[PDB]
Amino acid sequence: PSLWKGLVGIGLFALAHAAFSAAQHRSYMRLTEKEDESLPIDIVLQTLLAFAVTCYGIVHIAGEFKDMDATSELKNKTFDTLRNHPSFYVFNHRGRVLFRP
Amino acid sequence: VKLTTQAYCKMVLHGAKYPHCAVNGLLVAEKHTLFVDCIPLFHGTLALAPMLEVALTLIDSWCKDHSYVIAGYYQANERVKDASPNQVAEKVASRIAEGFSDTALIMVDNTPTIHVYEHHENRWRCRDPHHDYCEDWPEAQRISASLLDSRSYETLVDFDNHLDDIRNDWTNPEINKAVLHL
Numbered sequence: 001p002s003l004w005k006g007l008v009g010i011g012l013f014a015l016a017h018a019a020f021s022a023a024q025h026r027s028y029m030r031l032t033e034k035e036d037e038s039l040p041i042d043i044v045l046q047t048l049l050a051f052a053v054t055c056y057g058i059v060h061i062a063g064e065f066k067d068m069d070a071t072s073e074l075k076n077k078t079f080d081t082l083r084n085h086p087s088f089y090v091f092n093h094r095g096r097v098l099f100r101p
Numbered sequence: 102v103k104l105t106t107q108a109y110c111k112m113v114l115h116g117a118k119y120p121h122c123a124v125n126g127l128l129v130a131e132k133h134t135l136f137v138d139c140i141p142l143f144h145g146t147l148a149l150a151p152m153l154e155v156a157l158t159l160i161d162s163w164c165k166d167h168s169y170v171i172a173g174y175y176q177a178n179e180r181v182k183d184a185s186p187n188q189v190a191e192k193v194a195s196r197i198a199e200g201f202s203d204t205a206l207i208m209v210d211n212t213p214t215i216h217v218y219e220h221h222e223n224r225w226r227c228r229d230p231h232h233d234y235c236e237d238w239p240e241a242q243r244i245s246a247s248l249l250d251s252r253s254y255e256t257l258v259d260f261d262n263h264l265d266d267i268r269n270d271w272t273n274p275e276i277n278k279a280v281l282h283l
Contacts, residue, residue, distance in 0.1 A: 094211035095120030
């Protein structure tokens with residue numbers, strides 16, 4: 001589906017929110033001068049989940065691959081679209097006297 | 102010597118479906134001669150033997166079961182003014198002459214508008230400069246325009262389009278099926 005863009009959007013939003021939460025916790029820890037200096041696992045889980053979701057989403061929105069075999073792109077071509085040369089077109093055919101003389 | 106409204110309508114439809122390219126086919130009839138219908142073969146580059154000699158048998162296999170027999174051959178040149186028969190027209194007319202007498206070599210003059218050359222011991226000489234016989238001209242001219250204005254040639258299919266996809270019917274059922282009710 002085309003909803004992968006919204007998925008990576010929500011992932012990036014959650015990642016930005018986790019970054020803001022980490023900034024707040026760092027400010028608090030530098031205010032109180034605690035020797036633990038351990039990020040809360042609550043925000044660490046959010047960061048990891050957002051990173052995983054966003055990476056899996058951008059893996060999908062990157063675009064699909066194409067076959068390497070050239071004989072696969074011309075399998076639907078027909079000689080009616082290969083004989084025509086846009087450079088050597090001539091306008092003295094019957095379509096001019098038939099369609100709108 | 103006369104063509105049926107179905108033969109003429111199929112001819113003009115195939116000629117209008119590919120204006121920039123040439124038009125060729127085989128007028129088949131029942132077994133004095135009346136051209137009931139035509140099977141359009143190819144377009145564009147016609148000076149090629151194998152696909153032309155495949156159509157012979159692939160149409161005979163249908164006509165022998167459908168009680169038909171190939172009577173003539175028509176060609177429409179690329180240019181709008183030149184209507185002289187090429188070597189291909191003669192080389193195909195000579196082939197049908199050995200399997201059915203009274204072969205007519207038809208040249209669709211883009212600018213009536215149809216020439217009929219007959220072979221009498223010396224060459225292929227036309228008859229349109231003197232006179233051309235048909236069953237009824239106004240009926241054909243009306244029913245042809247009735248399918249032309251509706252852009253039915255986009256729906257018409259020939260043998261070349263059938264060689265690309267077999268789901269297409271070279272006998273044109275949906276064309277003569279509309280012709281009967283008009």
